[PDB]
C-alpha cells in the first residue's frame, strides 16, 4: 500500500563522512572556451618568440 515519498535525513552526515573534496587549483588553467580569434594569435605569438630564444644563441642581442 502507501509508503514514504522523500527524505533528506541522512544526506548531510553521509557527505561529511570522508570530506567534501574541493578540486586542486593549478598554475596554468586550460584555454578550453577562450575566443578562437585570440587563440589563433596566441599560437603564433608563442611560435615566434620560441624561435627567438634559439636564435639568441647563434645570433645575439635578442633580449
Amino acid at each position: 500500500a502507501k509508503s514514504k515519498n522523500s527524505s533528506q535525513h541522512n544526506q548531510s552526515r553521509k557527505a561529511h563522512r570522508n570530506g567534501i573534496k574541493k578540486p586542486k587549483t593549478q598554475r596554468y588553467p586550460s584555454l578550453k572556451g577562450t575566443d578562437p580569434k585570440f587563440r589563433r594569435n596566441h599560437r603564433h605569438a608563442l611560435h615566434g618568440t620560441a624561435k627567438a630564444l634559439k636564435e639568441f644563441k647563434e645570433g645575439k642581442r635578442e633580449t
Partner: peptide
C-alpha cells in the same frame, strides 16, 4: 574572470553538489 568578449565575460564559480564541488563556467 577567464574570458572577455564583445559584450560579455566568462566567469568561473564553484558549485556544491552533494559530497563534492564542481567548477562551472
Amino acid at each position: 574572470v577567464y574570458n572577455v568578449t564583445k559584450s560579455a565575460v566568462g566567469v568561473i564559480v564553484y558549485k556544491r553538489v552533494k559530497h563534492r564541488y564542481i567548477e562551472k563556467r
